[PDB]
PDB file of C-alpha atoms in Angstrom:
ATOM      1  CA  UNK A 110      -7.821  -2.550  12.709  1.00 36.35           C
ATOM      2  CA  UNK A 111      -8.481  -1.872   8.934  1.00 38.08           C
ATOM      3  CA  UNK A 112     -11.852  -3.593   8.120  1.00 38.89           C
ATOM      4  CA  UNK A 113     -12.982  -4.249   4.544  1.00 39.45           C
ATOM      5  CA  UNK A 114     -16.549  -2.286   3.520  1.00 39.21           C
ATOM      6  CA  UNK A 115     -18.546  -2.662  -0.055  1.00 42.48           C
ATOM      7  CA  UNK A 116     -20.207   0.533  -0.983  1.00 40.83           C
ATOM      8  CA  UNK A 117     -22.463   1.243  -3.888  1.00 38.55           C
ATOM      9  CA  UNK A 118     -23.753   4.683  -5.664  1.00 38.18           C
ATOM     10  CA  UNK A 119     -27.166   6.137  -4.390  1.00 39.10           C
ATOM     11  CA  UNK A 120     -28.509   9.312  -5.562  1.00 37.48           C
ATOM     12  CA  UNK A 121     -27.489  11.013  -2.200  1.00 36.07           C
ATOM     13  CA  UNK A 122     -23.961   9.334  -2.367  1.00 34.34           C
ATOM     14  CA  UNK A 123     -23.372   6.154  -1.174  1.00 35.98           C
ATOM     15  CA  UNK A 124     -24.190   3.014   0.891  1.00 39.19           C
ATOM     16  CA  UNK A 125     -23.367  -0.273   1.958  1.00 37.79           C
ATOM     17  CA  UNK A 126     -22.073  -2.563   4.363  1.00 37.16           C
ATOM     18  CA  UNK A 127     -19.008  -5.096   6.304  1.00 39.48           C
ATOM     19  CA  UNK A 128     -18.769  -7.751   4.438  1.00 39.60           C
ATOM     20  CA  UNK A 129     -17.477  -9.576   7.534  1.00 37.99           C
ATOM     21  CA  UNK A 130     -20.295  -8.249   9.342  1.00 37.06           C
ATOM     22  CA  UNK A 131     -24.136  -9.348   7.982  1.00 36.41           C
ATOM     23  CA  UNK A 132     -26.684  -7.183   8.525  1.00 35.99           C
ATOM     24  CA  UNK A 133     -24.104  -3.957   9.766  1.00 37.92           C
ATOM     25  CA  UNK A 134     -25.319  -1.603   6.744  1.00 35.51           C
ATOM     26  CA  UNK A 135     -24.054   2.250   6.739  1.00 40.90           C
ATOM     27  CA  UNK A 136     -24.473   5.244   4.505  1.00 43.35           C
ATOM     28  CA  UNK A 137     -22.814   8.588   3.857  1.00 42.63           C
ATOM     29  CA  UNK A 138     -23.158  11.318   1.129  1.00 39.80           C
ATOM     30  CA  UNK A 139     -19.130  11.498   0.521  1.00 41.39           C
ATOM     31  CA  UNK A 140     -16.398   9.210   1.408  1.00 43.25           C
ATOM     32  CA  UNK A 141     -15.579  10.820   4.928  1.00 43.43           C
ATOM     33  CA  UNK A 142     -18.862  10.707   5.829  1.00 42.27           C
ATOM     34  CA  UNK A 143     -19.233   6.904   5.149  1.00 41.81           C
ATOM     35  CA  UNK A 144     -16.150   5.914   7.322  1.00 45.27           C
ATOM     36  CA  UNK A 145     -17.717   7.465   9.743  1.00 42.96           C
ATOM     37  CA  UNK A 146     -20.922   6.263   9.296  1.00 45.70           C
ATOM     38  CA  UNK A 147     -19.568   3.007   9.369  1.00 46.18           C
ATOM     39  CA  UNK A 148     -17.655   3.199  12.376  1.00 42.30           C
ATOM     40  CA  UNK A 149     -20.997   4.247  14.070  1.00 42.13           C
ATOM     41  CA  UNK A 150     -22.624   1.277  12.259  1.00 39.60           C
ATOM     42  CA  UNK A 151     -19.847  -1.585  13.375  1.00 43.65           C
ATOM     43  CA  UNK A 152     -20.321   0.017  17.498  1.00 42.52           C
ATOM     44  CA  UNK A 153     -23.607  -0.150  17.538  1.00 41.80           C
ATOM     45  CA  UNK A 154     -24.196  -3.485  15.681  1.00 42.72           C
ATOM     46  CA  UNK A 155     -21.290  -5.317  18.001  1.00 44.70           C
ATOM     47  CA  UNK A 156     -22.903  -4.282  21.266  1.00 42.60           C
ATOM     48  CA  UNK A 157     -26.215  -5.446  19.821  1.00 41.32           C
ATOM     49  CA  UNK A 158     -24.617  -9.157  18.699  1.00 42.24           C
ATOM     50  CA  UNK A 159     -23.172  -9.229  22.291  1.00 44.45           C
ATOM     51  CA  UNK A 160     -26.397  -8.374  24.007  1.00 42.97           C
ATOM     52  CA  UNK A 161     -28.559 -10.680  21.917  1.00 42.68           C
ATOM     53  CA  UNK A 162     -25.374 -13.931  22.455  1.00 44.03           C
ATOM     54  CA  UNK A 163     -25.259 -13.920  18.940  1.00 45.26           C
ATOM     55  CA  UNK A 164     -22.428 -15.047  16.927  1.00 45.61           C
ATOM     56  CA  UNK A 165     -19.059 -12.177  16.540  1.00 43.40           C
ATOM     57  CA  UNK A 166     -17.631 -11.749  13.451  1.00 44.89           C
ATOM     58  CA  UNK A 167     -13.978 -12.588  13.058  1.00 44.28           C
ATOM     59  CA  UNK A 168     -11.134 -10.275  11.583  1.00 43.37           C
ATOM     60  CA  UNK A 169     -10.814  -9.306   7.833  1.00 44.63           C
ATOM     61  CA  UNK A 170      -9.917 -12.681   6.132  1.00 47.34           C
ATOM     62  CA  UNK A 171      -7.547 -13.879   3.350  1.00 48.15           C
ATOM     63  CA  UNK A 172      -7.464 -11.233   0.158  1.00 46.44           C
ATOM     64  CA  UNK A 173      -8.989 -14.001  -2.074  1.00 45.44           C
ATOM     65  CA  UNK A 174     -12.071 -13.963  -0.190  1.00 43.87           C
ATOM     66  CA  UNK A 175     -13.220 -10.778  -1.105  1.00 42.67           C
ATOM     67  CA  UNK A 176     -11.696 -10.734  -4.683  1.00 40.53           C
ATOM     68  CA  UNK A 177     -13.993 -13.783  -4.972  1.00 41.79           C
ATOM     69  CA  UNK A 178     -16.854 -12.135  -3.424  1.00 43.17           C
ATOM     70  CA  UNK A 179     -19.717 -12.158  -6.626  1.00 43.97           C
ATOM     71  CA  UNK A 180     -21.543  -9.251  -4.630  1.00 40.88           C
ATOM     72  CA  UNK A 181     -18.842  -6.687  -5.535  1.00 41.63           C
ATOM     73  CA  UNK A 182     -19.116  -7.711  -9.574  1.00 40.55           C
ATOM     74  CA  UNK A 183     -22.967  -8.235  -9.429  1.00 42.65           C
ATOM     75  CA  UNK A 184     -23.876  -4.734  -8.384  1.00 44.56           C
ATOM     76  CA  UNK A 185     -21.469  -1.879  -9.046  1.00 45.90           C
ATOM     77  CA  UNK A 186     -20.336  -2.700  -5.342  1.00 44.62           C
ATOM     78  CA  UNK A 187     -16.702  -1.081  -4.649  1.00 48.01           C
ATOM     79  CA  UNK A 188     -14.395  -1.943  -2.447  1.00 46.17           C
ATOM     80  CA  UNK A 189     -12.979   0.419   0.504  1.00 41.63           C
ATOM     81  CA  UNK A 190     -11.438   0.568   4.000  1.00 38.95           C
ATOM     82  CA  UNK A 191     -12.591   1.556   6.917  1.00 37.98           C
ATOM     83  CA  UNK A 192      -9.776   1.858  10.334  1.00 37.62           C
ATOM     84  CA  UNK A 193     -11.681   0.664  13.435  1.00 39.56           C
ATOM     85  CA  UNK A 194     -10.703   0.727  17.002  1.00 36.01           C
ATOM     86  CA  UNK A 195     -12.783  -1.296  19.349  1.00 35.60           C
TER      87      UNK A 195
ATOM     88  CA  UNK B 162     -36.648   3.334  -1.680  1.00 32.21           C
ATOM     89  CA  UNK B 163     -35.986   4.952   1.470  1.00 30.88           C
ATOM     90  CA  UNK B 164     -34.736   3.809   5.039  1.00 30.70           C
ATOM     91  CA  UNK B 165     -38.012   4.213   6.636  1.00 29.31           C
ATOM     92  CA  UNK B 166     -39.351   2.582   3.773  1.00 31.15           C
ATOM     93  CA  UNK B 167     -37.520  -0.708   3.788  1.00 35.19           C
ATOM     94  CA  UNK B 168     -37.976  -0.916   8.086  1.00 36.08           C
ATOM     95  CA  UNK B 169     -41.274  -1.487   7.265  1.00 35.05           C
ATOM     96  CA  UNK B 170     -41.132  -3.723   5.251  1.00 37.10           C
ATOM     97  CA  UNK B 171     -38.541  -5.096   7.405  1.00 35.31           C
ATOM     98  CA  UNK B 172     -41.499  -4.790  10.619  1.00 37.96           C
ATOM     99  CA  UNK B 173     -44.064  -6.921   8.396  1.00 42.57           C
ATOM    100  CA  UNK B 174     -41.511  -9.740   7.922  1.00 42.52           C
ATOM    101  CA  UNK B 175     -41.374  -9.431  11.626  1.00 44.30           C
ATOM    102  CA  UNK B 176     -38.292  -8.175  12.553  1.00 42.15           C
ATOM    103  CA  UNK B 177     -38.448  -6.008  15.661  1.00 43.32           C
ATOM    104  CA  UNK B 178     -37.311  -2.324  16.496  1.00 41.70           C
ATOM    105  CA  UNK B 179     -34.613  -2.722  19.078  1.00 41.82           C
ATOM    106  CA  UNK B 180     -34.002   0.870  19.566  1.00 44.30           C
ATOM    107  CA  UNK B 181     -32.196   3.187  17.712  1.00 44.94           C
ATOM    108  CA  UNK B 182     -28.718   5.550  18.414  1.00 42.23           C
ATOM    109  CA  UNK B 183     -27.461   9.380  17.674  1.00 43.12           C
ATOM    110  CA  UNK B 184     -25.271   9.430  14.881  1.00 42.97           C
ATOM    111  CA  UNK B 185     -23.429  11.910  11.795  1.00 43.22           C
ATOM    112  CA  UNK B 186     -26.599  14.226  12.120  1.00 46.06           C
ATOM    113  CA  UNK B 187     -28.553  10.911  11.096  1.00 47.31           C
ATOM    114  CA  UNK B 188     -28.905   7.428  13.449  1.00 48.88           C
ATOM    115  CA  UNK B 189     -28.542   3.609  13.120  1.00 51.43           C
ATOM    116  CA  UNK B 190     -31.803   1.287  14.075  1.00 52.55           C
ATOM    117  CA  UNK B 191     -31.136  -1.961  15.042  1.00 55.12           C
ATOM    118  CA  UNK B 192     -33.659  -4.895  14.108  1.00 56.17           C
ATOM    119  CA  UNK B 193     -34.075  -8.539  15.449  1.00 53.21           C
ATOM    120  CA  UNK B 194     -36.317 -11.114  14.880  1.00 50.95           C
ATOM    121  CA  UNK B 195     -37.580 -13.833  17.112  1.00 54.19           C
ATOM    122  CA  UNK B 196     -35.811 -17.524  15.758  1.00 51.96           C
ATOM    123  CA  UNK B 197     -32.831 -15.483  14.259  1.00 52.38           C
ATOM    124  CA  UNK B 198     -29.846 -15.315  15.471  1.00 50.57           C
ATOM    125  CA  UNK B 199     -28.529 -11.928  13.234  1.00 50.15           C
ATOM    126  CA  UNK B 200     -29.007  -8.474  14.053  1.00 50.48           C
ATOM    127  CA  UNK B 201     -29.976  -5.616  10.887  1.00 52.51           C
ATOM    128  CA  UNK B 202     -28.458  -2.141  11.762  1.00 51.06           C
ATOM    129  CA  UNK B 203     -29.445   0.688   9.282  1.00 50.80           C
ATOM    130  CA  UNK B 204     -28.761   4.120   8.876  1.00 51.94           C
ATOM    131  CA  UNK B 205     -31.695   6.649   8.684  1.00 48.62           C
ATOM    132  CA  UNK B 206     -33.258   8.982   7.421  1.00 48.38           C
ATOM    133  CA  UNK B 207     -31.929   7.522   3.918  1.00 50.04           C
ATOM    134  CA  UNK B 208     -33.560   9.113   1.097  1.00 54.38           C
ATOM    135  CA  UNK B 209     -32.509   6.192  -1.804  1.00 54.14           C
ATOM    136  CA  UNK B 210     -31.023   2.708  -0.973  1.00 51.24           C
ATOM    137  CA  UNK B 211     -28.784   1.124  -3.385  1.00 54.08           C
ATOM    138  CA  UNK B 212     -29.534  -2.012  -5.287  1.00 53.16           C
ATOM    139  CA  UNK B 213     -26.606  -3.783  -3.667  1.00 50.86           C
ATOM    140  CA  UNK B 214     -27.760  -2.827  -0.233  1.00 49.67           C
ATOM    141  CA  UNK B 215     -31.152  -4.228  -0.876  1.00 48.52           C
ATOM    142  CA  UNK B 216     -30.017  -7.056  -2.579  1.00 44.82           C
ATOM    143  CA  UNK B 217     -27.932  -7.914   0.706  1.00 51.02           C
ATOM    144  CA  UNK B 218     -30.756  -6.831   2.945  1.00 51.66           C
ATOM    145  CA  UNK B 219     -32.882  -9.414   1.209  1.00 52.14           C
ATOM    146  CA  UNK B 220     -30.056 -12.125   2.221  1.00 50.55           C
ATOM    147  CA  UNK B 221     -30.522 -11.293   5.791  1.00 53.86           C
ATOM    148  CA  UNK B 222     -34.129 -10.924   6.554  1.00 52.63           C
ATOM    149  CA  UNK B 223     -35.108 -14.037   3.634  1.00 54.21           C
ATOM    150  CA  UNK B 224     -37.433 -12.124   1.460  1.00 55.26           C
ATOM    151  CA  UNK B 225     -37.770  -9.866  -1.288  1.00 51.72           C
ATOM    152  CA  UNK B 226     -37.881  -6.014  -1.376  1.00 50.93           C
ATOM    153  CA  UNK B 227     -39.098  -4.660  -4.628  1.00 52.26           C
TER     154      UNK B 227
ATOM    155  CA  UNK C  20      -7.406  12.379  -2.239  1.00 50.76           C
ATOM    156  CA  UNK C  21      -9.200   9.346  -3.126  1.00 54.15           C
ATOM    157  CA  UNK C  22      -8.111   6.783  -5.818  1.00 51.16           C
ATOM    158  CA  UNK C  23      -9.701   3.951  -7.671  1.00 49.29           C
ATOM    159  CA  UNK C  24      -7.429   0.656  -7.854  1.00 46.82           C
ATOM    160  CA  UNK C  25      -7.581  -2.625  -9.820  1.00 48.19           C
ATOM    161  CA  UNK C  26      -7.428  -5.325  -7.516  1.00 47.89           C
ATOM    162  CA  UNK C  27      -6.147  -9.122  -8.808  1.00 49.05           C
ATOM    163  CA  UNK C  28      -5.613 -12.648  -7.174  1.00 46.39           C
ATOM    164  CA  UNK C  29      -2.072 -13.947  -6.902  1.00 48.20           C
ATOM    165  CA  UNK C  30      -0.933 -17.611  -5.672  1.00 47.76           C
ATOM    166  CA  UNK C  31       0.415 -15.622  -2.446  1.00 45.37           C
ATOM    167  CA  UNK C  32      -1.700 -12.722  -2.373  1.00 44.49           C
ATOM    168  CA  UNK C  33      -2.826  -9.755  -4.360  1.00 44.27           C
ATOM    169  CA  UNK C  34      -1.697  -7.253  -6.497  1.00 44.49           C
ATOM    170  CA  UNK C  35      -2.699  -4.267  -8.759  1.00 44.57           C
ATOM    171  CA  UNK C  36      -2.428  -1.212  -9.974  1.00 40.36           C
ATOM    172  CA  UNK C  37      -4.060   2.742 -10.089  1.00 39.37           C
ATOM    173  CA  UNK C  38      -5.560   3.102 -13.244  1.00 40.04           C
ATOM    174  CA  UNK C  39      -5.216   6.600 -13.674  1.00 41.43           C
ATOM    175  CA  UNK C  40      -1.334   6.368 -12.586  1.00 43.09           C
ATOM    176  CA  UNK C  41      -0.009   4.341 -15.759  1.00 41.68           C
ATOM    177  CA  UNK C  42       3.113   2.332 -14.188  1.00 42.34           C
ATOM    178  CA  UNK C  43       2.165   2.370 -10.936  1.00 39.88           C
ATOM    179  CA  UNK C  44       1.649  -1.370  -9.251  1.00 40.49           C
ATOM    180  CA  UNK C  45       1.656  -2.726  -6.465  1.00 40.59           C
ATOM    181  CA  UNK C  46       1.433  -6.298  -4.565  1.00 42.16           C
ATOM    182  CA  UNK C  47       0.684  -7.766  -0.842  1.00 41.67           C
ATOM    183  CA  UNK C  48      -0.319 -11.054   1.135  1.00 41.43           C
ATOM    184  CA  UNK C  49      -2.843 -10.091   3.450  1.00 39.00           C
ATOM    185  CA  UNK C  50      -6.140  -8.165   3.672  1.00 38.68           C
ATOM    186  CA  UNK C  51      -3.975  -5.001   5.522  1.00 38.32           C
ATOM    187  CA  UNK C  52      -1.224  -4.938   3.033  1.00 37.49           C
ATOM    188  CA  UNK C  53      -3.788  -3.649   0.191  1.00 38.32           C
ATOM    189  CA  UNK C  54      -4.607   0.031   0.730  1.00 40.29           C
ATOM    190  CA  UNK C  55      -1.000   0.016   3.137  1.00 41.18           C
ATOM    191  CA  UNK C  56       1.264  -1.489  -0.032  1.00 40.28           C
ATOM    192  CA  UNK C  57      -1.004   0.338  -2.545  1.00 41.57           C
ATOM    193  CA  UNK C  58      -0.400   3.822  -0.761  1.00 38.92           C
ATOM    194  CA  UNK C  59       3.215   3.171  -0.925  1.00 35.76           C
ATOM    195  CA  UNK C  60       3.202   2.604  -4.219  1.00 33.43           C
ATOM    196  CA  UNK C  61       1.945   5.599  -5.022  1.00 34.50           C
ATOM    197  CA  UNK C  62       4.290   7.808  -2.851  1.00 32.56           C
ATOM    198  CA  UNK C  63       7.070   6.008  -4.515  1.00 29.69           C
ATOM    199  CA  UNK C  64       5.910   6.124  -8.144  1.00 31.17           C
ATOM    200  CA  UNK C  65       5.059   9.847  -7.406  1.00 35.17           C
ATOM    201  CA  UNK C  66       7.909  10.881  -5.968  1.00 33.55           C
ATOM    202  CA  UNK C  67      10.433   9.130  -8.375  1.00 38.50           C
ATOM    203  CA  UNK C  68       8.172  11.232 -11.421  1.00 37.41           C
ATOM    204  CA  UNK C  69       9.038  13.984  -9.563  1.00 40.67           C
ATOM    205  CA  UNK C  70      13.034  13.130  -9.249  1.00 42.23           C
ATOM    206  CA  UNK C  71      13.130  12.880 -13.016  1.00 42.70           C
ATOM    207  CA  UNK C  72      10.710  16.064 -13.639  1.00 45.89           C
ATOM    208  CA  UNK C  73       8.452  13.885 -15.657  1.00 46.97           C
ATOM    209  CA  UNK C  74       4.764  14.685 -16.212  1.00 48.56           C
ATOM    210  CA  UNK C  75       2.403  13.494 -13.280  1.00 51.98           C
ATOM    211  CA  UNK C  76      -0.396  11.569 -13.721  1.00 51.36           C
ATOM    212  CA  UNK C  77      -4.047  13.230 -14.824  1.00 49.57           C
ATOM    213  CA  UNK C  78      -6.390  13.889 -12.167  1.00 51.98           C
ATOM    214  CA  UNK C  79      -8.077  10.397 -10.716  1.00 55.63           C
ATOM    215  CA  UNK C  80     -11.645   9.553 -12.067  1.00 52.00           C
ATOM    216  CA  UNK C  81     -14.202   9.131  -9.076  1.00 53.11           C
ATOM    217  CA  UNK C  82     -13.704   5.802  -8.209  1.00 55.54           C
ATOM    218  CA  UNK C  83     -17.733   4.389  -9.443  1.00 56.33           C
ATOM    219  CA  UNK C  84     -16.235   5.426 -13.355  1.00 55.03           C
ATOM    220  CA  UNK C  85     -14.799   1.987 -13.299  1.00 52.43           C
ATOM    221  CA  UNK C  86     -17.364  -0.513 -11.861  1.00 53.38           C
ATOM    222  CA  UNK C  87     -17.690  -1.570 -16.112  1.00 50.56           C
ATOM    223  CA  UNK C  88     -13.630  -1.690 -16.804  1.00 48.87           C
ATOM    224  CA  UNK C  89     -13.262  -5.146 -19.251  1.00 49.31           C
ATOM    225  CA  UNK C  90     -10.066  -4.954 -17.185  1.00 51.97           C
ATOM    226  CA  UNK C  91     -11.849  -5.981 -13.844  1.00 45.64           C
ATOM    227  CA  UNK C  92     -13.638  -8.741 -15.548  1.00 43.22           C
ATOM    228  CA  UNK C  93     -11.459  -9.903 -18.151  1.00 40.10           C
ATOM    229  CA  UNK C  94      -9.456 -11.440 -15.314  1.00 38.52           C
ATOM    230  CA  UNK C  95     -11.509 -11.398 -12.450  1.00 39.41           C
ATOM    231  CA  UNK C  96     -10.211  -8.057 -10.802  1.00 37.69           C
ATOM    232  CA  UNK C  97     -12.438  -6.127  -8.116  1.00 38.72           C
ATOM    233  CA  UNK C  98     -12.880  -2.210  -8.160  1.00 38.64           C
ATOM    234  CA  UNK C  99     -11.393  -1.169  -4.827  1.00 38.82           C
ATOM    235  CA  UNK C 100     -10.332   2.610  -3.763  1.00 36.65           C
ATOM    236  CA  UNK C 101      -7.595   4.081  -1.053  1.00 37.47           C
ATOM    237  CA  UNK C 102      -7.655   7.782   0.746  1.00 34.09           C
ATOM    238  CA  UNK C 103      -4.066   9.321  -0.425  1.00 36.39           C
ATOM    239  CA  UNK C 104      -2.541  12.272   2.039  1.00 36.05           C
ATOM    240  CA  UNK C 105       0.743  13.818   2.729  1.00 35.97           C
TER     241      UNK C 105
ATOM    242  CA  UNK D 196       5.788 -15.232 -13.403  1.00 35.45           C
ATOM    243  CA  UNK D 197       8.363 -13.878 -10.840  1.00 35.89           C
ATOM    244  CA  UNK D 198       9.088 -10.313 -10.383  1.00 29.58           C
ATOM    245  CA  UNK D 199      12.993 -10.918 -12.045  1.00 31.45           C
ATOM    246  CA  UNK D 200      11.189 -12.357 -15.310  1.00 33.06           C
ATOM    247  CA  UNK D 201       8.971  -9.530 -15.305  1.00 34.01           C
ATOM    248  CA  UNK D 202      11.715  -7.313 -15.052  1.00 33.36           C
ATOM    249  CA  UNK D 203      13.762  -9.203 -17.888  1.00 33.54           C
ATOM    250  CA  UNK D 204      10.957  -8.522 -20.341  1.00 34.77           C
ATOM    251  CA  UNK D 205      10.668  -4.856 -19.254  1.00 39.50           C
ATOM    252  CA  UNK D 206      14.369  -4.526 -20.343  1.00 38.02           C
ATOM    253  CA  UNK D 207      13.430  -6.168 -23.698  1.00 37.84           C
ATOM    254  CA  UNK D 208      11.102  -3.895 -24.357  1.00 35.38           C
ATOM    255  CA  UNK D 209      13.475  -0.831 -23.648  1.00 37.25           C
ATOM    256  CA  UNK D 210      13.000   0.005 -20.349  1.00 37.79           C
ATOM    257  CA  UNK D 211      15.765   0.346 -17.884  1.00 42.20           C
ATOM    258  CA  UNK D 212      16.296  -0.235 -14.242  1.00 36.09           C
ATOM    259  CA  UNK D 213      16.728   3.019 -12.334  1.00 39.83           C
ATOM    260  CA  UNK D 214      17.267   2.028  -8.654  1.00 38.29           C
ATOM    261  CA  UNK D 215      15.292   0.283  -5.632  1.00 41.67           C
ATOM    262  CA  UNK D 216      12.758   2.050  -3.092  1.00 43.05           C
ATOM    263  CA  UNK D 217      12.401   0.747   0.499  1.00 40.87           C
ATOM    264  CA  UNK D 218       9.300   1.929   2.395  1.00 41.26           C
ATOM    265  CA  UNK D 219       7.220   0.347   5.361  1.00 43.51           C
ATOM    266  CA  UNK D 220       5.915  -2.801   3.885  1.00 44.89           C
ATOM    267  CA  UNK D 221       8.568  -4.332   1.627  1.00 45.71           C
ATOM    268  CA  UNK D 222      10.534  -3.154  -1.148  1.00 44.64           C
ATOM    269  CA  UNK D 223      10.152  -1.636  -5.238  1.00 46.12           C
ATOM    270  CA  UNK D 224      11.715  -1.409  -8.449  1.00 43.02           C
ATOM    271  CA  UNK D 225      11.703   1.646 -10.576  1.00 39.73           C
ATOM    272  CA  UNK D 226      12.199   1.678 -14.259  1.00 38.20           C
ATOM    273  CA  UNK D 227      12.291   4.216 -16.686  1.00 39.65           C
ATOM    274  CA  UNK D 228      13.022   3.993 -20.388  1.00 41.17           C
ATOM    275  CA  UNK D 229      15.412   5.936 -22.698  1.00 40.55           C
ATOM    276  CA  UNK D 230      13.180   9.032 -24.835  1.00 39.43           C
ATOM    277  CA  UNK D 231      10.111   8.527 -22.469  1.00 39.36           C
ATOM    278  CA  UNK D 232       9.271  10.993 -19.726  1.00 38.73           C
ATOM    279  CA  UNK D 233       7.728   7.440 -17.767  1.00 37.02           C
ATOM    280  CA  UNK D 234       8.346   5.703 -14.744  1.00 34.19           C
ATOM    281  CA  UNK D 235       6.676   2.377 -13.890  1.00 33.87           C
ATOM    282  CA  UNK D 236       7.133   1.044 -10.169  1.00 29.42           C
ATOM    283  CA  UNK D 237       6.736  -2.432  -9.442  1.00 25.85           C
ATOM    284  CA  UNK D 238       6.760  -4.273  -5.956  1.00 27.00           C
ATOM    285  CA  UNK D 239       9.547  -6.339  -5.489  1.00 28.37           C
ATOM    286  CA  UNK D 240      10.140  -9.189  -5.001  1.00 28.86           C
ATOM    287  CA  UNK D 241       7.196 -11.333  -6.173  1.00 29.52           C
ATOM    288  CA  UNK D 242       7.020 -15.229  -6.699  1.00 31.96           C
ATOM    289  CA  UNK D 243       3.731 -14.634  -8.424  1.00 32.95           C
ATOM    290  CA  UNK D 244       1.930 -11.887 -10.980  1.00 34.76           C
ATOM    291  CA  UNK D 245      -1.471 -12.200 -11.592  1.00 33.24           C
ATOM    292  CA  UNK D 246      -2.412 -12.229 -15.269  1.00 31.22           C
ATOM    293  CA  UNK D 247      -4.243  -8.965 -14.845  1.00 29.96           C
ATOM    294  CA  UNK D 248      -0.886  -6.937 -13.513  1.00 30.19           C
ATOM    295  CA  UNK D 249       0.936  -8.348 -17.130  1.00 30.21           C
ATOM    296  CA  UNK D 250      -2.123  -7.447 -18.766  1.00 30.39           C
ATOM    297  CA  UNK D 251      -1.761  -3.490 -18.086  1.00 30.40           C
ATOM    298  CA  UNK D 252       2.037  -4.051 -18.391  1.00 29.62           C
ATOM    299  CA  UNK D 253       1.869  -4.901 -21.729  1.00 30.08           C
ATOM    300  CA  UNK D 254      -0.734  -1.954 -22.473  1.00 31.08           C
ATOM    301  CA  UNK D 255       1.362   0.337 -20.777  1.00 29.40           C
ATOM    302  CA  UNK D 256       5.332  -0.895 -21.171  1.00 30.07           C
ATOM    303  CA  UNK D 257       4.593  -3.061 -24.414  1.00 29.53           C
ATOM    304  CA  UNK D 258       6.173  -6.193 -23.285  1.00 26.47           C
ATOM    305  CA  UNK D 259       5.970 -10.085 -24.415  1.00 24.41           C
ATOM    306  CA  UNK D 260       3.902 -11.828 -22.380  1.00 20.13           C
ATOM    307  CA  UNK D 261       4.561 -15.272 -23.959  1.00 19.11           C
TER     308      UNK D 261
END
């Protein structure tokens, strides 16, 4: 499943996080390295939600939600895809 | 700021190291804290953090990093 | 390759274009169909430049070149970027 | 604006259409116009175009946008 990330320039490349998912952050110093990152990030941050009996995230929602999304135009945030299997 | 950096700050707002897990050279932490029902997972070692990140990690944990 | 694209709201959906392919656009309905629709786009536009033997577009910028594009905010676009391969 | 307006006003402004394209996801429309080495693809067919799409087509194709 193709899951929505923000990213946003650091000095050693880039970071950010699901948008879907609060509090699942990532990093990576070029593009490949950030999907993977990511990936990493998503696996370990579900199996902590499920071990905790903390509310799941649902799938990647309507388009509009993240055009709207004031945290991609407040701070250089871009937006990318990440492909996820669980 | 770096990853190790904003964990503690992260510690002193009294979220709690969960354990951490072998990753792209690097690893992903895992933070709770008691009363909240979300879970922080970072990368580190990260030598800079982005605005946006922080601005985000601020959202989660309810307080300021600056 | 990776490639910036302009992302906008429709009634139905979304659509967009690369801006460093002029005339190539592209549209979709749900969160999937962006970097899916986009990529087609592309391999059409691309490939019907290369029917006619017409110039192909300049290099792409890296993606974080236009997080300030009027574009984006003049009608609330978002900065979004797709992996292109063969 | 629907994609067949859109297209109307591309012929206006010169351009011509040169055929359909069929991938895995829906269909395009390529145009080209007489004395320029251009293409531009469109998707196809739209009920809706948001103001920014028409907003590069007129910097690019040089159409009305009324």
């Amino acid at each position: 499943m193709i899951y929505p990330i923000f990213i946003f320039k650091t000095v050693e490349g880039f970071d950010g996080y699901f948008p879907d998912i609060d509090g699942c952050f990532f990093a990576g110093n070029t593009f490949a390295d950030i999907s993977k990152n990511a990936e990493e990030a998503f696996a370990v941050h579900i199996e902590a939600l499920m071990n905790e009996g903390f509310p799941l995230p649902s799938p990647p929602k309507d388009p509009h939600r993240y055009i709207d999304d004031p945290r991609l135009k407040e701070e250089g945030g871009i937006l990318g895809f990440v492909e996820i299997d669980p | 700021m770096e990853s190790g950096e904003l964990i503690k700050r992260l510690e002193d707002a009294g979220w709690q190291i969960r354990g951490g897990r072998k990753t792209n050279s690097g690893s992903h932490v895992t933070l709770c804290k008691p009363g909240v029902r979300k879970i922080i997972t970072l990368p580190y070692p990260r030598k800079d953090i982005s605005k946006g990140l922080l601005r985000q990690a601020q959202k989660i944990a309810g307080i300021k990093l600056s």
